[PDB]
Amino acid sequence: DTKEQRILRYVQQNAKPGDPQSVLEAIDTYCTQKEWAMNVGDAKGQIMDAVIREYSPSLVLELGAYCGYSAVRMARLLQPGARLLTMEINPDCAAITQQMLNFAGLQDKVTILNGASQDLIPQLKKKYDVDTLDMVFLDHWKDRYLPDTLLLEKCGLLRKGTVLLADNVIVPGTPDFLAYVRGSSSFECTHYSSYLEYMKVVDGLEKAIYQGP
Template identity: 65%
Template sequence: MLENWILTILVSVGVGSVLFMVALFVLLKNNVHAKIFWNEIVLEKITNFVMDQSKEQRILNSVSYNAVKGDPESVLDCIDKYCSQKEWAMNVGDEKGLILDNVVKEADPTTALELGTYCGYSAIRIARLLKPKAHLFSIEFNPEFVPIAKEIIEIAGLSDKVTILEGHAQDIIPQLKSKYDVDTLDFVFLDHWKERYAPDTILLEECGLLRKGSILLADNIIYPGAPEFLEYIRNHKRFECTNYPSHLEYMKVEDAMEKAVYLG
């Protein structure tokens, strides 16, 4: 009797475990929120604990070991390969990176600004396309990301084209003219906190940093989304907008980028 009861419990636990794993697999396959949660909260935290280093440090290690020093394309390819095959990360990625490339070429900026450096992936994509005396300022608030981004950008051979400014965009933007000798910005890439897209765009206007023809490009306007930003730029005659459908970096999930040309 006792043996039958124990066997029933074991079978129930086994069946329950299988059903749980199947349900988890289906959830991770079909739900982007679950995928991001699993990658960013569960797997990343476990890997960080086991390896005693951050995901961003592991990306840097991969670049250091595998990329060709002084070759931006090699660095970008290395990061894309790592983040698509091993650990998902919030770079703009290879697919949307082509959109970024084309808009940067269109803007042909002398002075560019990036909001959100992370590991330096998009900074490298932008800086490698800049003309000889052009420069990119990139703002990153996370002090743990800054040295990693600087080292990856150095490996790409683009340190002379990029200045990383550590702090919050709302604090640094008002200092660009006085402290960093920026007159106006030809190109701005928004890829930081999505709720800051709209207020930081307004701040750029208020600080006189946008000129007629300045181009803004915003990432992740569908996932995780930036509705306030879209409402602002699409409902003001000062902006002419273009939408670029795409996918979330390294995933088959609908996303898009939005270009806004400032008309003054």
């Protein structure tokens, strides 16, 4: 019996089906009071919400769903018809995420793909009928942020104005990605200082807006 299963059960027993906000609150309570977990959390979550509301993206890709906290956070603010694709390599966590979204009533807005970003990204166009992405949320292995950004570009998935939003650019940190986007003319970057989920430790989000070649 895992921490992730305990989080899901806590949601199911302490939130209201179909009420995404109650789901977020339940997860944040459990992770504050019972067991820490690597959800983006409320501090960084509020910044995410402000970004999502600014851009109202029609198609979002998330790398690293975990238990679905960020997927619930984003999907609850998407406009009608807008969609989120989220990728998760750990099959147990993919299943938790699907159940989390089902409980939240967000399952028609989100597709949870069980697999590795580097395998799935090149299939997005032909298999998932993607043209280009409006926003990408990076929250998977930190050493994959840079390679998968470059892969997204190679596959023609970025357009002028695509918003990349990256978790954990301070802790654990993603130093190659951060140096790269901040030094590249193809990205316009902004740093949003915040706190590591459920902890009094500084962390932050980076927004990197793609500008084309």
